[PDB]
Amino acid sequence: MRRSKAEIQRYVENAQNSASSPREKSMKGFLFARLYYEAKEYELAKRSVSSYISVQERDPKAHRFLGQLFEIEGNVEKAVGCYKRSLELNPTQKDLTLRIAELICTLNIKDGRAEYWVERASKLFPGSPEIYRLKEQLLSSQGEAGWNQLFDLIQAELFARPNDVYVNLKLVD
Amino acid sequence: SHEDMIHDAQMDYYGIRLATCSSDRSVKIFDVKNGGQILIADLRGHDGPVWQVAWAHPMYGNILASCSYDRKVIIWKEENGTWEKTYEYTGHDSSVNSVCWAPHDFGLVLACGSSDGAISILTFTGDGPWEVKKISNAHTIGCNAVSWAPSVIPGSLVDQPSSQKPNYIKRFVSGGCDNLVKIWREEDGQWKEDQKLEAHSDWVRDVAWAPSIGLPTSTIASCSQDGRVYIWTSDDAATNCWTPKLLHKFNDVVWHVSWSITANILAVSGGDNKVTLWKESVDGQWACISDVNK
């Protein structure tokens, strides 16, 4: 994808020429946010996201896009809030919970709510070595209450299918 | 005038009379000419806040119906530009909510939907008395809304665009607060169990049938109390297959969902102060074009 400053500028101008209505431009803001994010315009991307919400609020796709943008930026709290809003709106995609658990594991939070969220994400996705290592580190930093849930999840995974070499190594460690 | 809140405000089929039913204890109908307005009718006979309203066709009889928070059904008839008394019913388990007539393809059968636990259908036959159809043990908590369904929709029966006249029998849907949706069809000379479904465990606000004038696809867009929406689509023959699919969900209190007069634009009104006006595009999908503020 050959993209540059002038390339994003002419993309934006061509998208503006492809819309002769303010509400149509606001609806096309889900792409304008990505264009501004690529051109390094976080405030303009947030404004485009708000404009697209003002015309089509309460939708899982827009909330997931906003959460992904916040996660790539660094606003972990904003991403967690957006994912929670998307979950309370319609918990159809477990990717929101997966990213919430990933952010919690990267932030290292010792709390019962964090442990419950990690357990829920593990029950959702039993695979993925990245999230496995994340939840293992989290439940090891926790204590015995988290180690019991980790052992239960490992036993359930082993009963469902043969475990992995790294999984067995981490369990023995 | 209308100093208090205004509920529904319908217009005549030609664009002259404007019937606005509000809670201001006054129903004023003005005129539409030269962009102005002149008061021409002042009706008042309810005991509580007036809610919904529905018009009719002058070829079958200029008759209006008004529901209020008093368990009373009020009906007026138009003669020489003056509306007088017609049919006045009173007494129910709860206050009447929804009220609408069947389309012109059937007749002038009124539907009464309220959280009373039963269904009371009023049928206007002849030029005087009426008939009452009572259906009990059909709602645990009660009804909520009733949306009629014409037989001129090719999406229900694949035999209309073939020089064949379909049956003109009564068919509609219902989605009360009994955690169950249901379909009603006038078969075996009465009403019984046709098709029920379970898709919620609380309250459901209203529903909207698509009055397609040339679209061979029958759709129904629902709206619940917790922002839940269901789009039941059908395009088969004889028996239909309602698919409980989802579209744009909400978390507030979605209230009304209304289809256009020719099944072109859907208007959804709830607690977001925005009425998303959807429309079927040429690619067989949905797209929103215009909005409005509340």
Side-chain angles (χ1 to χ4, degrees):
Chain A
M1 300 270 99
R2 181 183 171 184
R3 306 195 164 227
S4 180
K5 303 309 176 76
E7 299 200 82
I8 296 157
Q9 281 314 115
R10 61 181 170 86
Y11 288 164
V12 164
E13 89 98 20
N14 287 152
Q16 287 332 289
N17 293 342
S18 193
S20 195
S21 297
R23 189 184 183 278
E24 283 173 359
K25 185 250 193 163
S26 297
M27 268 284 186
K28 224 53 209 178
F30 76 107
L31 287 185
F32 302 155
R34 165 204 85 186
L35 291 167
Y36 297 149
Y37 203 87
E38 290 180 309
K40 202 57 164 196
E41 290 175 286
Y42 294 160
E43 309 301 313
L44 223 55
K46 283 187 269 184
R47 205 261 312 161
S48 313
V49 162
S50 296
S51 197
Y52 177 58
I53 285 180
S54 299
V55 297
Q56 207 39 64
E57 66 269 8
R58 322 218 196 218
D59 276 327
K61 185 169 73 175
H63 291 316
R64 172 59 184 204
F65 188 52
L66 187 53
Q68 279 302 124
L69 285 178
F70 272 135
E71 173 176 89
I72 299 161
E73 248 181 273
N75 309 356
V76 279
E77 297 294 324
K78 300 306 178 282
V80 162
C82 288
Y83 289 145
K84 272 295 292 181
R85 205 254 182 267
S86 187
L87 278 168
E88 258 77 2
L89 166 71
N90 210 4
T92 59
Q93 307 171 11
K94 313 303 180 186
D95 291 331
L96 324 155
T97 308
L98 182 65
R99 294 284 177 198
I100 277 181
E102 282 168 281
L103 293 172
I104 285 171
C105 289
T106 51
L107 285 170
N108 299 91
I109 302 305
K110 334 285 191 70
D111 202 1
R113 175 101 263 178
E115 289 172 73
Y116 189 39
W117 273 101
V118 156
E119 256 315 292
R120 286 148 69 184
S122 324
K123 290 187 297 177
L124 284 177
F125 296 104
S128 302
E130 189 165 274
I131 201 44
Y132 170 74
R133 287 291 205 279
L134 284 172
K135 72 184 67 149
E136 188 260 328
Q137 287 167 263
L138 189 132
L139 299 170
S140 67
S141 299
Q142 285 322 114
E144 277 306 308
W147 190 92
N148 293 319
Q149 303 159 359
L150 193 43
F151 190 73
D152 182 34
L153 164 85
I154 284 158
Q155 258 52 231
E157 285 174 15
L158 182 54
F159 158 70
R161 85 267 194 187
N163 275 348
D164 288 349
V165 276
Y166 299 102
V167 171
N168 291 130
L169 159 74
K170 282 309 179 283
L171 173 64
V172 175
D173 274 344
Chain B
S1 293
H2 288 275
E3 312 314 299
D4 212 29
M5 48 91 68
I6 297 105
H7 270 291
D8 276 348
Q10 217 73 38
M11 63 183 284
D12 201 32
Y13 279 72
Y14 305 119
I16 308 166
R17 272 82 63 192
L18 313 170
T20 72
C21 35
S22 313
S23 310
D24 53 348
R25 309 265 72 200
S26 294
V27 179
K28 291 176 283 298
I29 300 107
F30 314 94
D31 289 313
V32 177
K33 50 216 196 314
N34 314 117
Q37 35 90 27
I38 285 190
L39 187 46
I40 212 53
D42 194 13
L43 266 80
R44 193 244 185 270
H46 318 78
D47 278 343
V50 192
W51 272 330
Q52 316 309 120
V53 86
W55 280 78
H57 211 77
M59 264 279 105
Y60 299 90
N62 215 350
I63 306 162
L64 276 179
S66 280
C67 280
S68 174
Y69 189 77
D70 39 25
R71 316 178 174 170
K72 173 180 44 178
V73 197
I74 305 177
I75 288 99
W76 317 83
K77 57 165 83 73
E78 186 260 338
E79 273 89 7
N80 313 113
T82 311
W83 304 80
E84 61 250 25
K85 192 253 216 185
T86 311
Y87 181 72
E88 304 292 325
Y89 193 70
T90 173
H92 278 113
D93 193 18
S94 299
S95 291
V96 280
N97 309 141
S98 310
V99 44
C100 54
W101 273 284
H104 325 297
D105 190 32
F106 297 149
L108 264 193
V109 169
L110 193 69
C112 171
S114 51
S115 289
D116 302 354
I119 288 100
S120 176
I121 296 307
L122 258 296
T123 298
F124 163 66
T125 53
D127 304 308
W130 307 265
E131 276 81 50
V132 277
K133 316 294 184 315
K134 215 72 201 79
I135 295 103
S136 178
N137 290 320
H139 284 84
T140 297
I141 320 293
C143 179
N144 280 150
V146 165
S147 170
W148 274 107
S151 63
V152 288
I153 314 297
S156 181
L157 310 154
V158 197
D159 77 313
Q160 192 266 311
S162 295
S163 182
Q164 295 172 277
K165 303 291 183 289
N167 57 87
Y168 293 160
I169 332 172
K170 328 286 122 161
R171 281 108 74 191
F172 61 94
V173 308
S174 295
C177 40
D178 60 336
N179 317 329
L180 292 165
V181 87
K182 212 184 167 292
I183 326 289
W184 260 271
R185 147 86 155 90
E186 185 162 280
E187 95 250 12
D188 296 332
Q190 50 149 112
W191 304 87
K192 50 163 290 299
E193 168 59 82
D194 189 19
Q195 198 267 329
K196 69 178 179 66
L197 198 138
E198 36 264 20
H200 41 89
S201 196
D202 40 355
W203 295 358
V204 161
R205 279 259 61 81
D206 303 295
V207 278
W209 167 282
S212 283
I213 210 59
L215 261 301
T217 288
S218 144
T219 212
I220 293 120
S222 75
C223 42
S224 310
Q225 267 282 111
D226 292 322
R228 311 191 303 283
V229 56
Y230 311 119
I231 315 293
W232 293 293
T233 63
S234 84
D235 201 352
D236 298 331
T239 68
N240 296 345
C241 299
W242 311 116
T243 77
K245 293 296 183 288
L246 330 168
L247 214 56
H248 43 283
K249 287 290 189 168
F250 298 96
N251 282 344
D252 50 344
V253 188
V254 174
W255 266 291
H256 267 178
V257 161
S258 171
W259 258 114
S260 293
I261 47 152
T262 48
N264 276 22
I265 294 168
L266 255 184
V268 184
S269 176
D272 289 314
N273 292 10
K274 263 93 186 171
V275 180
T276 61
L277 296 179
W278 295 83
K279 150 181 176 305
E280 317 296 313
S281 56
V282 314
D283 318 308
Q285 300 283 344
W286 298 64
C288 202
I289 34 166
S290 46
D291 253 336
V292 89
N293 194 45
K294 297 202 285 284

